[PDB]
Amino acid sequence: HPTRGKLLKRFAQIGPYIREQQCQESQFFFDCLAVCVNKKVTPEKREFWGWWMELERNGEQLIYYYQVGLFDKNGDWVNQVISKKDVIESIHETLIRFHDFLQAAVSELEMTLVPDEKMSNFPLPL
Amino acid sequence: LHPTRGKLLKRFAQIGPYIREQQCESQFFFDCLAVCVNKKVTPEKREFWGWWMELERNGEQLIYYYQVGLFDKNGDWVNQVISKKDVIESIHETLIRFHDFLQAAVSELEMTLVPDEKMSNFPLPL
DSSP: OOHHHHHHHHTTTTTTBOOGGOOTTTTTEEEEEEEEEETTTTTTGGGGEEEEEEEEEEEEEEEEEEEEEOOOTSOOOOOOOOHHHHHHHHHHHHHHHHHHHHHHHHTTTTEEEEEGGGGGGSSSOO | OOHHHHHHHHHHHHHOOTTTTOOOEEEEEEEEEEEOTTTTTOOSSOOOOEEEEEEEETTTTTEEEEEEEEOOOOOOOSOOOOOHHHHHHHHHHHHHHHHHHHHHHHHHOOEEEEGGGGGGOOOOOO
């Protein structure tokens, strides 16, 4: 096919990125809590700068849409990022590394990765 | 991701005989054989009341999920516990002491430790 189950399993093998509970039919969800916002906050209320990605399946095509931003206390992602070079670089390194592994996994599945049209406004190289 | 899986494994192993390396992919596995079920049984078929814990990684965050139960003759953990105050108290004491070390290790690693949402159904204080 390959099966949704096959995809889920192979994507989970990339590492601690896929969030299975937020995946449904033909849509997969990945994220990365890359940098803590403020460690003075109690652990359970801490927030993180990072990225999240939505992967739509369209037959043998997987269509990717990454956003950079903020993961708040509720587990909501917001498209706002601290304007610090070092933090942005850290987010970008985790994203690039992930995308490289994703490329490899999709190639092994004999499928193809393609950017969402909204990636034209993505503010980092990829 | 930094720190690495390898570094986390070694750091967690330093806490004591809890982590089970052969059961750790983007998840770490810990357990504790707190109370022997019946000492009259030979050491081959011995079973234990205790706990096990799955620690998930997402970036700088580590997410813990403890369960209390029975480590059976087959080497499988089951979420059932003998309904005895003294046994439950002993399990609980091992768990709290372990958790205190885990908290200190995660802090040393400069990461954030938070309960899994399923810990809302954990039947003991933590």
